[PDB]
Amino acid sequence: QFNPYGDNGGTILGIAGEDFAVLAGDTRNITDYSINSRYEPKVFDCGDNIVMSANGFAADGDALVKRFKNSVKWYHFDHNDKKLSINSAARNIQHLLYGKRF
Amino acid sequence: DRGVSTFSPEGRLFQVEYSLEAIKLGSTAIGIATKEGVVLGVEKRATSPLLESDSIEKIVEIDRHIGCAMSGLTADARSMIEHARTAAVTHNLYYDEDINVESLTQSVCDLALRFGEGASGEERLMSRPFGVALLIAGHDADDGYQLFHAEPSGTFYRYNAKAIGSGSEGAQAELLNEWHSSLTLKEAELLVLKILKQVMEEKLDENNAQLSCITKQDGFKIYDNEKTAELIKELKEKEAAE
Amino acid sequence: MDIILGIRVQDSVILASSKAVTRGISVLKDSDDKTRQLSPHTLMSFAGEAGDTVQFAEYIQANIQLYSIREDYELSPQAVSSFVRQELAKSIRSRRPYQVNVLIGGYDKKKNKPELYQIDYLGTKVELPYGAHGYSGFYTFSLLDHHYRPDMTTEEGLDLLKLCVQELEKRMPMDFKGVIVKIVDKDGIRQVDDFQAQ
Amino acid sequence: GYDRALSIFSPDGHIFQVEYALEAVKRGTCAVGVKGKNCVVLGCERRSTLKLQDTRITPSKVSKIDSHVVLSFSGLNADSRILIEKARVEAQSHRLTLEDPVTVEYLTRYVAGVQQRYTQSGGVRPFGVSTLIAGFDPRDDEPKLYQTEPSGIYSSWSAQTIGRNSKTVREFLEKNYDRKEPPATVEECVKLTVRSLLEVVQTGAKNIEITVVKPDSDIVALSSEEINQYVTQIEQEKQEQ
Amino acid sequence: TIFSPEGRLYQVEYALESISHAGTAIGIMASDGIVLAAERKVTSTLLEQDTSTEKLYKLNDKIAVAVAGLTADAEILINTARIHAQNYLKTYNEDIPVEILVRRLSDIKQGYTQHGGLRPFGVSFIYAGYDDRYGYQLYTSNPSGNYTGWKAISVGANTSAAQTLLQMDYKDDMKVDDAIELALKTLSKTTDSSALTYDRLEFATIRKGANDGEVYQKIFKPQEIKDILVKTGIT
Amino acid sequence: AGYDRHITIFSPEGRLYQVEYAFKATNQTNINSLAVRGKDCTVVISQKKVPDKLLDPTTVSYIFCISRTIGMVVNGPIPDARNAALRAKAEAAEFRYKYGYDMPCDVLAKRMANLSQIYTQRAYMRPLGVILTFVSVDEELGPSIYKTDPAGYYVGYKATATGPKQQEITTNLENHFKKSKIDHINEESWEKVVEFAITHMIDALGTEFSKNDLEVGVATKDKFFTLSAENIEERLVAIAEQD
Amino acid sequence: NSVFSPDGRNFQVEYAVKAVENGTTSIGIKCNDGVVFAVEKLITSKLLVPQKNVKIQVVDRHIGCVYSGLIPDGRHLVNRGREEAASFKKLYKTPIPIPAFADRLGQYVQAHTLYNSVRPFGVSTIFGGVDKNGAHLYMLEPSGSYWGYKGAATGKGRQSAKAELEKLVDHHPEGLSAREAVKQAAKIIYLAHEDNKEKDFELEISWCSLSETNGLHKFVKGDLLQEAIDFAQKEIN
Amino acid sequence: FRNNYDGDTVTFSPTGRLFQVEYALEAIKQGSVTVGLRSNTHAVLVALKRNADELSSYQKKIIKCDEHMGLSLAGLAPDARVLSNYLRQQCNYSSLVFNRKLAVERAGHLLCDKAQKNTQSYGGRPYGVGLLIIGYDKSGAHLLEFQPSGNVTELYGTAIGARSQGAKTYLERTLDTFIKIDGNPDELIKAGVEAISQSLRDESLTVDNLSIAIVGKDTPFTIYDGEAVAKYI
Amino acid sequence: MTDRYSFSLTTFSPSGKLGQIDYALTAVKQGVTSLGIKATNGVVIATEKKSSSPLAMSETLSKVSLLTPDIGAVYSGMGPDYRVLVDKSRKVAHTSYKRIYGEYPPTKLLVSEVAKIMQEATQSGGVRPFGVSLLIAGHDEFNGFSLYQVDPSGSYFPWKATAIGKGSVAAKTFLEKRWNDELELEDAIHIALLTLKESVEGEFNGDTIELAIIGDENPDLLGYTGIPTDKGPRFRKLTSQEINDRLEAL
């Protein structure tokens, strides 16, 4: 049967300081026992001083990052160029994820 | 008489122009925007002494930071208010924050476009324009206190002060002279009350005019009668001594 | 599995319904009323699947109440029970059937008879001197076959039930936390709210 | 799909179909409601184009929506049934989802909303109906009376009237109804209601009917004789020079 | 489906207008039954009268209607009335109350009044029925979706003449037989023919069924009209 | 304006103006056609007029191959003609798929006739300004001519004519059959039947034809085909050495 | 529109023709292995970017389309022409034959004369190309009427343009060449600008020739364009 | 003649005109003035905003469509919102699906095709707005004029709205100067601001009166209002 | 594409007329005369085959149509309307009856369905009424022989004999004078043949006259033997030759 999912392996790490934050990821992408790439970034600047990583099945990760970058874009269009605050991003991202609950 | 959304030779939409006329027949509503808040006041206009005047709801909350006054065919405003409330609450659901006043207004104006007899928009579910205009007032972090006038055209306008309804021509000129960028909230309240007194077709009291405002710090409050009466017992006295 | 019993005496119908609500390993409530009033002279008791149960009962209730106000008139127990049946029979073939069994007890004022209808989630309907849903019927049917008389008083009907309950408290694996008992007669519906330590 | 717009704006800013609907309301037989200290009364007139009717089976003018709220109307009778149905359904639905019966205001807002919606939809005409809605909120004693009209506007009235020659009866009520001193009991509230109907009906025979709503779903209609006892007691009593 | 400046319904008024030209039908309600009687509009010798029906229709076993207006618009509505009675029976295992079936047909009529820009049905009905909540009942509905109940009533041609005469001779304590009599008398005087013959008539009764405690519907045969016309001295 | 002039509702006299006007449209190209039956063929002739010198004449046609066995000639403007032709092609292929034999000439006529009837009855569709003459050698019926018009009418013919000068051609043909006393051209080769058809077209129109003034279609058992200029020329040569 | 006037014509179609006659002039010329198209573009203002308001349009790879009348209507029609070519290729694999492409536009245009809720197209479209069996040229009127043409013209200067075309046909029974027709089209466009000469104009030509473009549709630019602008300027001074 | 022929857009007049389209065009003539012009490295929009009152806002007339594209309006403003929205989505679709910035020209064709549908559908109206579209893409700077008839033309400069003719005159004569304002945003804006003046009987254009947008080689489409434009008066 | 006339084209006038129905009736008035006569052992329906030019083939036109093996129809008014009504009627006899009960509908009920189709054209949006009147002759076990007229309004009614179209007034009279309830079929044919001679202008023979009977079961018209529980269809179209023979003894 067709399985719509894979695992591209990949680990990400976020730490918050007093007036900074880091988001780190390895740059390796895998399938089973093979290396697809040694440098395929998975941590992204999304505009508005937000970085994002969606790790696991890389196809799903990319789709989500795209959809969120676009969210930010339309947020600018629909709200007079207002900066999307990190809490507001978080909530938006919950809705993106939950819309695919099934 | 041919179609709902037809152009006149001068390039105006017949139905949009006639709705604007229905609004001129409406009760007066006045809004004043200051730096201590925005004030909204209305002429109740009971069609009879037997009307329980406070069942007349022409100033309504949209969200804690946004209020609205209407004028014209006020029954048409229900679905606009309902839609504005949903937009504001939904925005908070999706974004964990308050909708911006302009954005809320633009949404109400989007709603207003949706007229046409199965019109090649896509999908126009509404047969005529609304017969009601709205003053939308509120506060937000980016652009402070704000006032908007939203017509059934789908156009909206920001104003320092504005008046709509039957007394609007007279009220607008009065606002033109009286408005300045240093008005306190209390002054603004007196001015609304005053200009309503001038144009009301009765003697302005606390049962046939209603006041309200929004402060950043306390949200949107409709003033209850006793608080209004006091300002009315007070305008009279500022306007006796001069 | 919830005990749902019905006995029809001469001038009334008595319904007895267990108070327990159990999910998994916990009894969450010991005072549940597994009953909705459908009209002043028609009461419905219900058991079955966790959510379906109340949703169906309240839905039937709204519909009968609507009919009442629209005709300013009370439907007969027989008419109420045909409505319920058809509702279940349509549901059984839909995408997600209602998993609900019901007893309907009413006093028909136009006829002056009490009436008891048993209906399962399939839409199987039957009029009976006494009825039950689930396991409990495996005990009570034979008990009532023996001790039941068609011309009993309401008081005798209550003693007949006491026995039925007693037997179920002796032989059923699960603690159903006693029953709520209700009588439907010419006056209406009352709760005999003192049956457990009676 | 027939969505050809019927209710449109005229050059002077009026919607004629809504306007012509109001005419039908004034063409409709009269109806009146007055709210007392702890009651609300509703009165209607019957017409006389025919006088060989059966009244046991012919639909009365006061309708129960729920057990605590009633509705009377002036205008097209056929139009009013549709509103009554929709009102009754909403009343059940509100019970089902809020576990509370409707407030009188809520039921009014609902009915008014339905009427407004019919002023702005392709290929439908507005309701030739204006309504009075009366009752008490659950667990509340403060009495309630509202009016809606074909436009969808609604409000509350200490007392109010609609239909043919309501102009006349609103005249009366404006003189008589004292804000300070609601009519303090059932009987004298029925009095003020019968008086105001007398101007327009002629004889209170088989045309004047009355319904009384008290708190907690207490609603009783009156009989021909109980009517006649107010008719008799007012015509003789109020004629002295 | 539009209003006039006065607040009337163009198409409806004109539909009532249409009905005023149709064969007359009369319903009379008695203590122990109901009479329905209707006149066929300007006929012919060759017109079959045996297998004919055009004004009197059975709705279920306890309810009949008399038609004034466009026959074919009426068939449509009779068909849906029949179906509606059956849905009710199937749902409830009880024959439909007369009021309920009447209100439903009136609601359909009202629809064409309010939306969809289709013409109203050019039909008025007299309904004769029995149920066990209200006993014998007589109803009228017209294209406006209005319905009312009556001790006696007429629809179609000459309703003014007809109504005057019924008001004159009707009384509450009437037996069905006097009502049959009154029905024919009233038709005798309102007809636009010379005299009233059997082939110009349709006739039905709803009686308590001689001996049984049960309700019977009789749609009179040609011969039976011919007979009942002799007794009442019209030969 | 009166609505009974613009849409297909009845006029007080029980008439349909748009249908009447649609009949008028059929003559707009100012072309006459005629059809006749041989012993085992069916011929259709139609005038061909190429005014403009800029037109490529090989594209200018009012004859259509509907299927292997059925030809159609249209009197009326080309766009309406083409619409009718596309639909009859589609209908004939669908019939074959669904029913497993070739759509007969009359059944296609009836089907097109019924489609026309609908425009006669429904307001949002105008009728088509065309008359369609269908020809074949039918496997059951034999040589066949069936003709439909904007009213939704159709009938079978021994022979027929259509166009401005329809009446002259018709009566000319009636006169031939009155004398011959048979309902077909008693000739074994289709070449002779074409020759007959042209000859009577000449006599009734009072005009001589060159090879570029005509269009010919012939239906035989299991084929309908149109003639080329040179086949037509050879037909014109043979009539010359006789008449 | 779904309305015949009492003479059997369609008055809405008739008025649509008026909109066409009112348009810029455009032509097509068939040659021995191809087709050439040219159009007149009115320079409304010095501000129009030269060469940048393209009017001729390709369908698939082998078909040119040019039109006079309401320009948007022409574009709408080409869009549909393009879906109509794709759907033919997708199913039958071969690119769409020009006769076939002509009927597809034919039928679509004709459908807009059947219903009173649609208006007809306010363009006449000249189009064509090379297929498996030769060069083909067509013109299609607001009625849906179309035929094959040796040469074609539409718009304000159609009469003068047609007259020029008539001359070429008569004087070249053997056939014209692609290179020749390109220049002749430039001439003809210059010689229909006479009937529209209150504004300055820019000339646009395209062609589709078996030997000159492999049977693909191409615009004529650079040297070859200038050469024909020369040839036309020469034979009018 | 001009009688039963302007009922809807689905109707030609006997002259061959579409009157509803002509009347839609008319709402433009009544709109506040806006100017567009471009060199080889940048494109500029200047839009004089028009207030309703001395107490009101001058209504915003320039809308951003992507990082490389934007437009200015004159006429029905709600109509500018529908079309700019469609353009936002089309620019978006080009980015998501193909990783391609949308060519200004394609945007033009797209707008044209959208406007066209409304000139042929029953029960719909033509758009009542004109739009000036500026962009920087793979073939450089671009300006487009959109008409609600669905005619889009590419131009070095233009103006639409009330007394646009003056500005359009000025620009025809100034052509050879402004086109060469390369790598100098500020001289292009000024040439635009001054060009809008040839259309003011009105007045001294003010700080809240003025709206300016620019797009260019290393310049994402940005709108300037108020304080930021003061240095141009 | 799409329908834009979602409203009834037949509305009530202030006098309470339905115009389009009256105009449909006027169209029927112009139509060639058609008639039906009910015998005791049969029914006959008949009309004239008004040819348009002798180049037309009259037999190829169906003025009298079989609807079911026991039910026929003829008409007056617009031929194309009749033709589509016949197709829809044959189909509905199946979809509404035979596919349900496995037997063909009785005459009254089939008539009822045609009537329904006609009524719907009177009330639906975007359509004009059918410009025909029909006569429907049938037989069915429980009602025996019957004859019905259906009009553009959807109204139907039973007749012992009648006529419609052009010469209807005169022919109704000719029939009234000649109809008794004791007529054999051969008599009703003869009577129909006489009535039709008044209507017609030109030749009056079996090639200008279409005539059908509803009579006895025709076994030899069944197509198969061996299920003795049907003897065949009761509907029969008289041949050209059979009409002429009755014309010599006319």
XYZ file of N, CA and C in Angstrom, chain C residues 121-177:
171
model
N -32.581 -0.201 19.546
C -31.886 0.717 18.667
C -32.113 0.397 17.204
N -32.615 -0.797 16.909
C -32.924 -1.172 15.534
C -34.255 -0.582 15.064
N -35.048 -0.089 16.006
C -36.426 0.254 15.710
C -37.376 -0.922 15.857
N -37.079 -1.846 16.774
C -37.971 -2.983 17.051
C -38.921 -2.564 18.155
N -40.216 -2.530 17.842
C -41.207 -2.036 18.793
C -42.200 -3.081 19.218
N -42.551 -3.003 20.487
C -43.468 -3.947 21.021
C -44.186 -3.328 22.243
N -45.485 -3.626 22.382
C -46.263 -3.192 23.565
C -46.353 -4.362 24.542
N -46.013 -4.109 25.803
C -45.843 -5.187 26.796
C -46.353 -4.823 28.192
N -46.854 -5.817 28.952
C -47.177 -5.578 30.376
C -45.946 -5.212 31.207
N -44.778 -5.684 30.769
C -43.492 -5.347 31.436
C -42.336 -5.516 30.448
N -41.283 -4.733 30.657
C -40.153 -4.787 29.770
C -38.840 -4.368 30.371
N -37.777 -4.695 29.648
C -36.409 -4.431 30.068
C -35.461 -4.387 28.870
N -34.364 -3.666 29.043
C -33.320 -3.677 28.040
C -32.019 -4.161 28.656
N -31.258 -4.881 27.839
C -29.948 -5.331 28.231
C -29.993 -6.655 28.962
N -29.011 -6.835 29.829
C -28.872 -8.053 30.594
C -30.008 -8.273 31.579
N -30.456 -7.197 32.220
C -31.419 -7.278 33.320
C -32.684 -8.057 32.978
N -33.092 -7.998 31.712
C -34.227 -8.782 31.241
C -34.046 -10.280 31.392
N -32.798 -10.735 31.420
C -32.530 -12.162 31.568
C -32.945 -12.654 32.953
N -32.996 -11.740 33.922
C -33.530 -12.052 35.237
C -35.014 -11.721 35.394
N -35.401 -10.496 35.034
C -36.723 -9.997 35.417
C -37.874 -10.588 34.616
N -37.657 -10.925 33.356
C -38.777 -11.421 32.563
C -39.460 -12.630 33.222
N -38.678 -13.576 33.718
C -39.238 -14.806 34.266
C -39.829 -14.555 35.637
N -39.187 -13.652 36.369
C -39.667 -13.244 37.663
C -41.075 -12.653 37.526
N -41.248 -11.760 36.550
C -42.517 -11.082 36.345
C -43.537 -12.022 35.720
N -43.082 -12.911 34.846
C -43.947 -13.947 34.278
C -44.690 -14.692 35.391
N -44.019 -14.814 36.542
C -44.520 -15.561 37.677
C -45.375 -14.683 38.587
N -44.805 -13.583 39.089
C -45.480 -12.738 40.083
C -46.431 -11.666 39.541
N -46.444 -11.443 38.231
C -47.241 -10.338 37.677
C -48.718 -10.698 37.496
N -49.582 -9.738 37.822
C -51.021 -9.864 37.589
C -51.535 -8.628 36.811
N -52.472 -8.817 35.855
C -52.832 -7.660 35.009
C -53.580 -6.533 35.754
N -54.227 -6.874 36.861
C -55.078 -5.928 37.559
C -54.494 -5.446 38.886
N -53.177 -5.270 38.946
C -52.530 -4.809 40.175
C -52.690 -3.310 40.389
N -52.693 -2.918 41.656
C -52.659 -1.516 42.033
C -51.250 -0.997 41.788
N -51.094 0.319 41.813
C -49.782 0.946 41.710
C -48.885 0.492 42.861
N -49.448 0.379 44.058
C -48.692 -0.082 45.230
C -48.099 -1.503 45.042
N -48.881 -2.403 44.457
C -48.429 -3.757 44.157
C -47.334 -3.782 43.092
N -47.495 -2.951 42.057
C -46.476 -2.713 41.043
C -45.150 -2.277 41.642
N -45.188 -1.389 42.631
C -43.971 -0.986 43.331
C -43.301 -2.128 44.103
N -44.090 -3.096 44.570
C -43.550 -4.251 45.297
C -42.992 -5.291 44.327
N -43.671 -5.436 43.199
C -43.177 -6.227 42.107
C -41.779 -5.741 41.682
N -41.595 -4.430 41.547
C -40.284 -3.877 41.218
C -39.237 -4.089 42.292
N -39.622 -3.883 43.546
C -38.706 -4.081 44.671
C -38.019 -5.464 44.528
N -38.829 -6.472 44.216
C -38.364 -7.808 43.954
C -37.388 -7.848 42.787
N -37.782 -7.236 41.667
C -36.968 -7.176 40.463
C -35.618 -6.552 40.758
N -35.622 -5.412 41.435
C -34.380 -4.787 41.855
C -33.570 -5.728 42.756
N -34.186 -6.238 43.826
C -33.522 -7.182 44.759
C -32.783 -8.328 44.075
N -33.479 -9.009 43.171
C -32.905 -10.040 42.343
C -31.705 -9.559 41.541
N -31.772 -8.337 41.014
C -30.663 -7.810 40.232
C -29.495 -7.404 41.121
N -29.782 -6.961 42.339
C -28.717 -6.666 43.287
C -28.058 -7.940 43.811
N -28.718 -9.080 43.641
C -28.154 -10.358 44.060
C -27.250 -10.999 42.993
N -27.672 -10.932 41.725
C -27.125 -11.773 40.655
C -26.337 -11.109 39.513
N -26.436 -9.782 39.386
C -25.720 -9.022 38.349
C -24.302 -8.694 38.803
N -23.310 -8.874 37.922
C -21.914 -8.633 38.302
C -21.631 -7.203 38.715
N -22.336 -6.243 38.142
C -21.939 -4.859 38.338
C -22.848 -4.120 39.313
N -22.246 -3.211 40.067
C -22.971 -2.362 40.998
C -23.651 -1.221 40.228
N -24.968 -1.306 40.077
C -25.676 -0.249 39.360
C -26.199 0.867 40.259
N -25.856 0.820 41.545
C -26.125 1.913 42.487
C -27.607 2.245 42.709
